[PDB]
């Protein structure tokens with residue numbers, strides 16, 4: 022009837038009709054009835070409770086979606102914070118919503134409704150505000166984790182941690198097996214925002230001129246337009262059939278053109294999503310797409326392998342300008358702060374500045390400044406304009422260069438860390454700060470006319486593809502191969518605790534209790550005492566690797582200066598070293614006693630040397646190269662190489678008992694049953710073969726996975742085989758007669774995975790029934806039809822030398838970020 | 849695969865970072881000369897990541913079939929930055945031209 026009177030409109034799709042108003046009518050009713058709002062909202066809420074339950078909803082119903090979205094609102098307008106706090110602060114509500122919806126909407130709801138909340142409430146709400154923003158990449162995307170365990174990683178002050186800990190403690194004698202973090206209180210710094218609307222990597226990401234909406238492009242071949250604040254999904258527009266090389270906003274941001282592998286530049290409307298104009302000229306790919314920063318005119322800088330610089334005009338159907346030169350490909354082509362000029366930057370060593378209106382040549386600069394000490398070649402990655410609109414900030418080879426357009430020469434020079442090559446560079450108009458992507462996901466913040474370290478950015482999943490500034494002067498954005506766009510604060514990241522750890526962490530054993538020994542980034546090492554904030558900083562010359570001795574009292578570490586340095590924990594002034602095996606030393610191990618140093622390198626010889634003795638005993642294997650070794654329960658030395666030659670040596674005298682070659686190529690370590698020295702195996706990166714020492718060749722062969730084998734595991738009292746692979750898959754195989762019986766699939770049929778596919782060392786349970794494995798995160802398996810737990814997670818990707826306590830309770834590990842991770846098992 | 853299309857994919861996506869020719873210098877990407885038969889990251893003069901050196905496979909048409917498919921997948925942690933060659937024909941072709949030049 023209301024449709025008949027034309028007060029209301031009705032859309033017909035599916036079985037259920039769909040009703041909605043028209044705007045004017047809405048505002049009208051808004052004005053006509055005001056005082057009665059409260060009545061209405063509290064009415065519908067009361068009704069809702071009287072029928073359904075807040076945590077009880079059937080996703081199969083027809084009304085679910087609406088409730089999930091706007092229920093918070095209807096509570097808010099009711100000005101009732103009690104039932105509000107009751108609903109929102111609840112964890113399961115969050116779980117369900119996130120699973121179905123995703124975080125962004127919810128975040129937005131917090132940010133909006135925070136007002137009605139009380140002063141104390143603000144703290145909690147806030148805790149969530151950062152919580153979800155940080156967890157943004159993990160949540161809502163299944164395979165799905167536990168809410169509680171993620172809540173356990175939160176600061177104690179945060180209500181999230183307190184609730185998660187509460188419920189955790191509530192579930193007892195439950196196969197949940199919760200964990201506790203003492204270390205995360207001083208680490209894992211907060212972030213402004215973390216948002217992934219991507220199944221694929223990000224090629225470029227930048228903020229709009231007005232700082233409102235974000236349009237991102239990547240390997241997904243889909244332009245993603247979403248809100249910059251709470252990260253809600255706005256529009257998803259298909260740019261091309263091929264991967265988009267580069268994309269950028271216009272002056273009014275209302276028009277964004279895309280360039281891709283299909284060699285066709287297509288202008289796309291942001292608020293529409295329909296084709297406006299299309300331009301096909303270039304016979305090569307276009308790596309340069311840049312728009313005007315002014316409303317004066319509209320131009321587009323394009324370049325390709327055809328050695329032509331073409332300047333397009335958005336007003337016409339053709340190209341405005343064409344310029345000769347640049348015999349090589351132009352990596353970065355960018356407009357000046359004025360549209361009257363054009364900047365062309367390539368890696369061939371030619372940096373040119375052309376007149377846009379005059380179309381002629383203004384300036385041409387070839388940089389010989391970088392010294393090679395075989396013609397001189399200086400590559401140029403990127404070109405960033407200074408805030409003054411005159412100087413040009415660039416980064417070449419191992420150094421940063423500041424050019425003056427007036428003098429055309431080298432005006433200034435900024436040093437970059439060590440010999441590392443600069444991958445990317447950017448400059449901030451405010452504070453004259455500049456960020457540089459150098460090596461291994463490291464974004465370093467430096468200041469001009471300073472040459473002193475300002476800030477360092479860590480916590481990334483991968484080496485930063487690229488980073489930009491938000492020109493409010495307040496903050497900046499980061500984009501990596503982790504497929505996630507992040508918002509970071511300039512002044513907040515500036516503070517660094519210098520907890521960085523490079524390749525290694527070292528566990529210490531005091532009786533049952535475990536202690537932490539870290540290798541310091543700056544000089545030597547940092548000693549961290551267990552269950553306390555006691556830290557003893559030890560400073561010496563740089564070290565390549567470190568190794569702890571049995572019975573303790575000593576330490577043995579290799580350096581970058583060569584050979585091996587042995588030092589006593591009692592007195593640091595006393596040290597012993599000898600020069601042998603010029604090649605890089607990898608593995609260093611003492612014998613069962615504190616004497617008879619056994620060391621190896623990359624070479625045909627392994628050294629056995631006695632100290633306080635100075636006995637030099639060389640053991641020749643007569644091969645191409647030797648990888649590493651290990652000590653068994655006996656005096657025998659089990660060693661492996663790249664040639665697939667497994668040898669058994671002895672102390673003080675070179676001896677070969679047997680020779681085991683499983684396959685061709687590099688063999689990874691060795692795998693023993695730990696029940697005895699009889700059964701022994703190793704990973705040949707092809708199949709899994711085991712020998713009982715009943716022959717010179719492996720007795721049993723397992724072909725189950727022939728593609729790649731990362732590792733294998735024999736559990737005690739069982740002997741059942743657990744195969745780790747390069748794909749990061751852990752397969753369970755029943756072993757009795759040395760043949761394959763059972764079957765399990767670790768991989769998911771849900772499709773490709775983003776982060777994972779890495780495993781190094783596997784651990785065992787004290788019961789023997791449970792299993793501990795790493796699929797890129799912490800994942801516990803189980804024998805006989807199903808596993809233990811998928812619980813929690815491991816931040817980052819790469820892992821190195823997983824270690825555990827002998828009681829199999831407290832755990833010690835580290836990610837690629839070099840952050841200390843300590844686990845404690847308590848009921 | 850095809851040799852000359854392999855030289856095309858070489859001059860495009862390879863030759864800028866690599867040398868497959870005999871006695872080629874090391875670059876951002878390593879000298880690839882004598883690739884087949886040589887283990888991952890064994891070439892002197894270029895500093896490899898441990899991710900590549902611990903890979904230790906023997907480069908071949910199939911190893912590159914899997915690697916060039918998704919170079920971050922096959923050797924995780926490599927400082928090689930590439931989004932992967934999804935097309936098989938491109939792989940076979942490029943690898944073929946590698947089998948030509950690196951042998952020469």
Ligand code: HEC
Nearest residue numbers: 861862865876877888889895896897900926927928929930
């Ligand atoms: C933008 C960077 C980049 C691109 C593009 C690139 N490479 Fe690589 N590549 C590298 C780097 C850096 C390494 C060394 C990896 C290491 O040291 O860990 C490498 C390693 C390799 C290796 C392994 C060499 C060995 O001895 O194990 C091969 C083969 C190779 N590249 C060939 C290719 C091919 C084929 C392509 C494209 C079809 C390509 N590269 C494109 C950077 C690149």
